[PDB]
Each structure stands twice: as C-alpha cells, then as structure tokens.
Amino acid sequence: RWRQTWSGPGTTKRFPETVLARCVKYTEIHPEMRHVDCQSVWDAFKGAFISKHPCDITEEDYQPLMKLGTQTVPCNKILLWSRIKDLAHQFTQVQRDMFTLEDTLLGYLADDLTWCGEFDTSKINYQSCPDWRKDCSNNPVSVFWKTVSRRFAEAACDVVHVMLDGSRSKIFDKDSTFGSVQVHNLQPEKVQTLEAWVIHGGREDSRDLCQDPTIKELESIISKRNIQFSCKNIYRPDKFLQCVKNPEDSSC
Ligand SMILES: N=c1c2ncn3c2ncn1[C@@H]1O[C@H](COP(=O)(O)OP(=O)(O)OC[C@H]2O[C@@H]3[C@H](O)[C@H]2O)[C@@H](O)[C@H]1O
C-alpha cells in the first residue's frame, strides 16, 4: 500500500532463511565456532524482536543470542571502523591482519540486513521497520548493532585500530556508534593505545587530517580515559591495499 506503519524499509526479504544459512556457512568456515547450533542461534535472534513492539527493544532482548554467539577474536588485532565499510573489509580479507565486527559470527549474521516484528503478532514485518531518527532508536536493528559494537570494543586490548572516513566534515563523529559506544567502552586497564587511520577520499594526499578539529577532540577524550592516542593519514587507500597485498611491492 501507500502508507506503511514506519518510515524505514521493512524486513530484508527471506530474513530467517538468510540468517540461518549465514549461520551454517560461518560455522563451516571458522572451526572454533563448530559447537554452535545454528537453529538455536536463529531462535535466540527471532526471540529478541518477535512479538515485541519494535520501539521497545532492549540489550537484554539480545542476551540470549549474545550468549550463543560468544566468541574470542584475538584481542590485540581488532579493527574498529566508522562509515568506511568496504576498505576495512577489503583490508582484513588479504591475510587476516585484523578482525572487524563483521568477521565475528554475530556481525556476519546481521551485516547489511534489516529486521523487525510487530507488538500484536508473531509476524515478521516485511513492509516497513522503524527509522533510527524519525521513529525510535530502540528498534531491533539499532539496538542489535549497539550491543554487539559495545561488547566488541570491550573485548579489545593492546593497540586498537580505528579506520575513519576523512571525507566527512565530521571524521570523528561523537554521535556515531564508534564515538558514543565504543570510545567509552574501551577498557583502560587493557587498551594501551587507540590508533586512528584517517582514510583520505581524493586529490590523493590532501591536508594532514590528523590535525582535524574532531581528531583533536577524539584525542583529548581518549587521553583523559588514560589511553594513548595515535593517528596516521592514509593518502591513497588504493595504494595502501596494494601495499598490504604485496609488501615491498615497490613502495610498501
Ligand atoms: N555491519 C553494519 C551494518 N550493515 C547494514 N547496516 C549496518 N549497521 C551497522 N553495522 C556495523 O555496526 C557499526 C556501527 O553501526 P553504525 O556506524 O551506527 O552504522 P550507521 O552509519 O548508523 O548505519 C546504520 C544503518 O546501516 C545498516 C543498518 O540497517 C542500520 O544500522 C558499523 O560500523 C558496522 O560495523
């Protein structure tokens, strides 16, 4: 029809089959995740949002699933990223130098998906889901990503890397999940340094974005939590990926 309940697009078509298949698949590639029963994962997942008003979703609603998806990612090789999805993934895919959220079982199950149910019903709503901004922040998708992103920051140790999109005017954005969940949930007992990689978008190597006002902010935020801060520009990310694929491949 012409109206729709919510302002957001509705559940990714064939959601259950997709999440379940992604489960099987991930438990096939990654051997320390073969104890996982995928149908169980699915039931945890479903039970987090099915028959709940999709604006009255909590982190607790997700804890059964967070328990089934329990995973150790080497705590010193974590790559956080904000608003620069594709470089972060093309990077970790070369030789697994680092792990992003989407290299975890849970992050790989939800990545690029949308889901919600209805209060009155056990039906998945394929027609519309709440919008973070126009409707409510406590919706199935937003709440999932916040909880998993928190846990993932809290898992991290030693030198933690963040990739940031330097093409944005707010390179460090206090209102992103990085700036408002992860930055606050890095554990200062365990995290020695946050190292920012500011990924330039063009004219190759523009200004030094490590002097960006928002970057001086991130820095003082992190310094006052007693974690050291370090920043590096990445001028040509294409060249940076070719260097990672072939170190000492002429410039690298
Ligand atoms: N993998 C996704 C993803 N795929 C699609 N989407 C994802 N959101 C977050 N995640 C991950 O959580 C992190 C934090 O989410 P956020 O920066 O708020 O994405 P935003 O720039 O706020 O984009 C959020 C929206 O983009 C969709 C969701 O439908 C909805 O969460 C992201 O860095 C990313 O690792």
Side-chain angles (χ1 to χ4, degrees), residues 1-202 206-235 237-245 247 252:
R1 76 176 138 80
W2 63 90
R3 197 159 15 244
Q4 292 325 348
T5 298
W6 303 115
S7 294
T11 300
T12 313
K13 61 155 177 202
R14 67 201 292 83
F15 184 66
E17 290 116 297
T18 299
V19 175
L20 180 67
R22 285 181 180 193
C23 202
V24 177
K25 181 154 215 287
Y26 201 97
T27 61
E28 296 170 335
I29 306 129
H30 298 95
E32 73 309 313
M33 295 305 273
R34 46 216 200 18
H35 75 275
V36 183
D37 164 278
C38 276
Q39 177 57 235
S40 287
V41 173
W42 175 244
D43 298 343
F45 214 143
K46 247 213 295 190
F49 71 101
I50 281 294
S51 295
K52 285 152 165 189
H53 193 279
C55 298
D56 186 11
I57 301 308
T58 73
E59 327 274 53
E60 279 99 309
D61 280 326
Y62 285 112
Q63 259 310 279
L65 172 71
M66 305 283 103
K67 291 183 208 11
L68 289 160
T70 277
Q71 222 190 134
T72 36
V73 58
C75 68
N76 62 317
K77 286 144 151 45
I78 277 181
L79 178 61
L80 305 183
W81 59 268
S82 193
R83 278 60 178 291
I84 190 78
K85 176 165 273 180
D86 280 26
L87 223 221
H89 304 149
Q90 291 155 193
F91 174 67
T92 60
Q93 198 136 16
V94 174
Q95 60 208 348
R96 310 164 287 109
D97 287 306
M98 309 191 198
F99 306 71
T100 66
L101 202 42
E102 283 74 35
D103 301 307
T104 71
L105 166 56
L106 291 173
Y108 170 95
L109 288 178
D111 191 32
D112 286 347
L113 299 177
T114 296
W115 63 91
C116 64
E118 286 210 75
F119 178 49
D120 35 23
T121 196
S122 59
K123 290 212 279 193
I124 285 156
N125 186 337
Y126 293 94
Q127 302 295 141
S128 69
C129 290
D131 177 78
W132 148 265
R133 204 191 169 203
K134 321 190 172 84
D135 298 314
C136 65
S137 38
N138 294 313
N139 63 245
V141 174
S142 293
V143 174
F144 170 88
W145 281 119
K146 176 155 188 148
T147 326
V148 289
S149 293
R150 192 183 85 241
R151 285 196 96 222
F152 188 76
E154 284 185 317
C157 77
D158 305 338
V159 181
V160 196
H161 297 82
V162 60
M163 250 178 209
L164 301 174
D165 182 359
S167 77
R168 277 184 215 238
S169 76
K170 284 215 253 228
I171 301 182
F172 175 68
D173 183 355
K174 285 154 26 156
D175 291 22
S176 70
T177 291
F178 175 59
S180 77
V181 181
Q182 301 195 308
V183 156
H184 303 296
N185 287 290
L186 295 168
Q187 301 298 307
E189 300 83 349
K190 295 188 315 179
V191 180
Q192 151 82 309
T193 310
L194 179 57
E195 172 146 282
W197 297 349
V198 185
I199 300 304
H200 281 60
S206 328
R207 312 106 63 212
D208 183 354
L209 295 171
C210 288
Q211 306 314 302
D212 191 65
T214 82
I215 295 301
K216 307 313 87 209
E217 214 166 45
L218 175 54
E219 168 181 70
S220 70
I221 295 191
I222 278 298
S223 310
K224 311 203 176 186
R225 308 257 285 128
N226 217 342
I227 296 164
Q228 287 193 248
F229 176 82
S230 154
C231 180
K232 286 215 216 223
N233 292 278
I234 309 179
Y235 290 114
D238 51 316
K239 188 192 63 168
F240 160 74
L241 238 216
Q242 185 47 242
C243 295
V244 187
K245 296 181 197 175
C252 311

PDB file of all heavy atoms in Angstrom, residues 51-65:
ATOM      1  N   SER A  51       7.214 -10.392  18.258  1.00  0.00           N
ATOM      2  CA  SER A  51       6.111 -10.130  19.243  1.00  0.00           C
ATOM      3  C   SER A  51       6.562  -9.092  20.236  1.00  0.00           C
ATOM      4  O   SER A  51       6.104  -9.152  21.383  1.00  0.00           O
ATOM      5  CB  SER A  51       5.752 -11.367  20.087  1.00  0.00           C
ATOM      6  OG  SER A  51       5.197 -12.427  19.271  1.00  0.00           O
ATOM      7  N   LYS A  52       7.510  -8.243  19.845  1.00  0.00           N
ATOM      8  CA  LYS A  52       7.866  -7.021  20.678  1.00  0.00           C
ATOM      9  C   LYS A  52       7.579  -5.790  19.936  1.00  0.00           C
ATOM     10  O   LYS A  52       7.737  -5.761  18.744  1.00  0.00           O
ATOM     11  CB  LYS A  52       9.322  -7.124  21.114  1.00  0.00           C
ATOM     12  CG  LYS A  52       9.418  -8.171  22.254  1.00  0.00           C
ATOM     13  CD  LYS A  52      10.715  -8.861  22.339  1.00  0.00           C
ATOM     14  CE  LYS A  52      10.915  -9.616  23.687  1.00  0.00           C
ATOM     15  NZ  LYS A  52      12.342 -10.078  23.750  1.00  0.00           N
ATOM     16  N   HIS A  53       7.088  -4.750  20.585  1.00  0.00           N
ATOM     17  CA  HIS A  53       6.908  -3.509  19.873  1.00  0.00           C
ATOM     18  C   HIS A  53       8.307  -3.106  19.355  1.00  0.00           C
ATOM     19  O   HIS A  53       9.253  -3.089  20.119  1.00  0.00           O
ATOM     20  CB  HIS A  53       6.375  -2.465  20.822  1.00  0.00           C
ATOM     21  CG  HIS A  53       5.861  -1.254  20.141  1.00  0.00           C
ATOM     22  ND1 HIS A  53       6.678  -0.240  19.687  1.00  0.00           N
ATOM     23  CD2 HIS A  53       4.609  -0.926  19.776  1.00  0.00           C
ATOM     24  CE1 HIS A  53       5.938   0.692  19.129  1.00  0.00           C
ATOM     25  NE2 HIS A  53       4.678   0.303  19.186  1.00  0.00           N
ATOM     26  N   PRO A  54       8.443  -2.829  18.066  1.00  0.00           N
ATOM     27  CA  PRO A  54       9.779  -2.582  17.549  1.00  0.00           C
ATOM     28  C   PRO A  54      10.417  -1.259  17.960  1.00  0.00           C
ATOM     29  O   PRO A  54      11.476  -0.932  17.412  1.00  0.00           O
ATOM     30  CB  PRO A  54       9.581  -2.654  16.016  1.00  0.00           C
ATOM     31  CG  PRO A  54       8.179  -2.335  15.803  1.00  0.00           C
ATOM     32  CD  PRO A  54       7.398  -2.745  17.034  1.00  0.00           C
ATOM     33  N   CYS A  55       9.732  -0.445  18.803  1.00  0.00           N
ATOM     34  CA  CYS A  55      10.386   0.657  19.539  1.00  0.00           C
ATOM     35  C   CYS A  55      10.567   0.341  21.026  1.00  0.00           C
ATOM     36  O   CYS A  55      10.868   1.207  21.805  1.00  0.00           O
ATOM     37  CB  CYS A  55       9.569   1.977  19.396  1.00  0.00           C
ATOM     38  SG  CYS A  55       9.522   2.458  17.628  1.00  0.00           S
ATOM     39  N   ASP A  56      10.355  -0.877  21.454  1.00  0.00           N
ATOM     40  CA  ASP A  56      10.565  -1.108  22.884  1.00  0.00           C
ATOM     41  C   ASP A  56      11.502  -2.295  22.979  1.00  0.00           C
ATOM     42  O   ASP A  56      11.207  -3.250  23.675  1.00  0.00           O
ATOM     43  CB  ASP A  56       9.194  -1.333  23.639  1.00  0.00           C
ATOM     44  CG  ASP A  56       9.338  -1.428  25.222  1.00  0.00           C
ATOM     45  OD1 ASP A  56      10.407  -1.132  25.788  1.00  0.00           O
ATOM     46  OD2 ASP A  56       8.403  -1.838  25.920  1.00  0.00           O
ATOM     47  N   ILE A  57      12.632  -2.223  22.246  1.00  0.00           N
ATOM     48  CA  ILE A  57      13.661  -3.246  22.203  1.00  0.00           C
ATOM     49  C   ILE A  57      14.827  -2.909  23.151  1.00  0.00           C
ATOM     50  O   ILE A  57      15.395  -1.801  23.153  1.00  0.00           O
ATOM     51  CB  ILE A  57      14.260  -3.472  20.754  1.00  0.00           C
ATOM     52  CG1 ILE A  57      13.190  -3.885  19.670  1.00  0.00           C
ATOM     53  CG2 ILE A  57      15.300  -4.605  20.795  1.00  0.00           C
ATOM     54  CD1 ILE A  57      12.281  -5.126  20.095  1.00  0.00           C
ATOM     55  N   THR A  58      15.249  -3.885  23.927  1.00  0.00           N
ATOM     56  CA  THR A  58      16.398  -3.664  24.847  1.00  0.00           C
ATOM     57  C   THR A  58      17.617  -4.529  24.529  1.00  0.00           C
ATOM     58  O   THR A  58      17.494  -5.568  23.814  1.00  0.00           O
ATOM     59  CB  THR A  58      15.948  -3.781  26.324  1.00  0.00           C
ATOM     60  OG1 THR A  58      15.693  -5.167  26.675  1.00  0.00           O
ATOM     61  CG2 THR A  58      14.645  -2.914  26.531  1.00  0.00           C
ATOM     62  N   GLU A  59      18.798  -4.107  25.041  1.00  0.00           N
ATOM     63  CA  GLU A  59      20.028  -5.005  25.038  1.00  0.00           C
ATOM     64  C   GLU A  59      19.703  -6.399  25.642  1.00  0.00           C
ATOM     65  O   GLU A  59      20.089  -7.446  25.042  1.00  0.00           O
ATOM     66  CB  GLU A  59      21.320  -4.427  25.689  1.00  0.00           C
ATOM     67  CG  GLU A  59      21.622  -2.923  25.623  1.00  0.00           C
ATOM     68  CD  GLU A  59      22.364  -2.377  24.355  1.00  0.00           C
ATOM     69  OE1 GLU A  59      21.913  -2.625  23.202  1.00  0.00           O
ATOM     70  OE2 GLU A  59      23.380  -1.644  24.505  1.00  0.00           O
ATOM     71  N   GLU A  60      18.931  -6.458  26.754  1.00  0.00           N
ATOM     72  CA  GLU A  60      18.574  -7.757  27.311  1.00  0.00           C
ATOM     73  C   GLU A  60      17.886  -8.644  26.315  1.00  0.00           C
ATOM     74  O   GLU A  60      17.994  -9.849  26.408  1.00  0.00           O
ATOM     75  CB  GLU A  60      17.593  -7.676  28.482  1.00  0.00           C
ATOM     76  CG  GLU A  60      18.208  -7.338  29.854  1.00  0.00           C
ATOM     77  CD  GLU A  60      18.035  -5.831  30.180  1.00  0.00           C
ATOM     78  OE1 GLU A  60      18.406  -5.013  29.275  1.00  0.00           O
ATOM     79  OE2 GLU A  60      17.485  -5.504  31.300  1.00  0.00           O
ATOM     80  N   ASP A  61      17.111  -8.056  25.419  1.00  0.00           N
ATOM     81  CA  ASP A  61      16.314  -8.844  24.498  1.00  0.00           C
ATOM     82  C   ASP A  61      17.284  -9.642  23.683  1.00  0.00           C
ATOM     83  O   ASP A  61      16.972 -10.747  23.255  1.00  0.00           O
ATOM     84  CB  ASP A  61      15.522  -7.963  23.532  1.00  0.00           C
ATOM     85  CG  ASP A  61      14.225  -7.368  24.161  1.00  0.00           C
ATOM     86  OD1 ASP A  61      13.558  -8.000  25.008  1.00  0.00           O
ATOM     87  OD2 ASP A  61      13.916  -6.212  23.782  1.00  0.00           O
ATOM     88  N   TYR A  62      18.440  -9.034  23.452  1.00  0.00           N
ATOM     89  CA  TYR A  62      19.544  -9.686  22.721  1.00  0.00           C
ATOM     90  C   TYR A  62      20.510 -10.680  23.458  1.00  0.00           C
ATOM     91  O   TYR A  62      21.247 -11.406  22.769  1.00  0.00           O
ATOM     92  CB  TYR A  62      20.318  -8.647  21.888  1.00  0.00           C
ATOM     93  CG  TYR A  62      19.549  -8.224  20.624  1.00  0.00           C
ATOM     94  CD1 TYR A  62      19.042  -6.957  20.498  1.00  0.00           C
ATOM     95  CD2 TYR A  62      19.333  -9.144  19.547  1.00  0.00           C
ATOM     96  CE1 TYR A  62      18.355  -6.547  19.284  1.00  0.00           C
ATOM     97  CE2 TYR A  62      18.645  -8.776  18.414  1.00  0.00           C
ATOM     98  CZ  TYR A  62      18.117  -7.445  18.300  1.00  0.00           C
ATOM     99  OH  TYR A  62      17.420  -7.077  17.121  1.00  0.00           O
ATOM    100  N   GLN A  63      20.457 -10.755  24.809  1.00  0.00           N
ATOM    101  CA  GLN A  63      21.428 -11.501  25.566  1.00  0.00           C
ATOM    102  C   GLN A  63      21.348 -13.010  25.300  1.00  0.00           C
ATOM    103  O   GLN A  63      22.349 -13.687  25.305  1.00  0.00           O
ATOM    104  CB  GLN A  63      21.297 -11.235  27.072  1.00  0.00           C
ATOM    105  CG  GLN A  63      22.319 -10.248  27.692  1.00  0.00           C
ATOM    106  CD  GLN A  63      23.830 -10.524  27.364  1.00  0.00           C
ATOM    107  OE1 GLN A  63      24.500 -11.376  27.971  1.00  0.00           O
ATOM    108  NE2 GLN A  63      24.360  -9.742  26.419  1.00  0.00           N
ATOM    109  N   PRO A  64      20.175 -13.561  25.126  1.00  0.00           N
ATOM    110  CA  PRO A  64      20.294 -14.994  24.679  1.00  0.00           C
ATOM    111  C   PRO A  64      21.181 -15.171  23.412  1.00  0.00           C
ATOM    112  O   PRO A  64      22.112 -15.976  23.425  1.00  0.00           O
ATOM    113  CB  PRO A  64      18.843 -15.410  24.473  1.00  0.00           C
ATOM    114  CG  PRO A  64      18.140 -14.654  25.668  1.00  0.00           C
ATOM    115  CD  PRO A  64      18.796 -13.203  25.538  1.00  0.00           C
ATOM    116  N   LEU A  65      20.902 -14.462  22.342  1.00  0.00           N
ATOM    117  CA  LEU A  65      21.746 -14.517  21.194  1.00  0.00           C
ATOM    118  C   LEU A  65      23.235 -14.175  21.478  1.00  0.00           C
ATOM    119  O   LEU A  65      24.104 -14.880  20.950  1.00  0.00           O
ATOM    120  CB  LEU A  65      21.191 -13.629  20.077  1.00  0.00           C
ATOM    121  CG  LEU A  65      22.011 -13.383  18.824  1.00  0.00           C
ATOM    122  CD1 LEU A  65      22.051 -14.675  18.008  1.00  0.00           C
ATOM    123  CD2 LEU A  65      21.431 -12.167  17.996  1.00  0.00           C
TER     124      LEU A  65
END
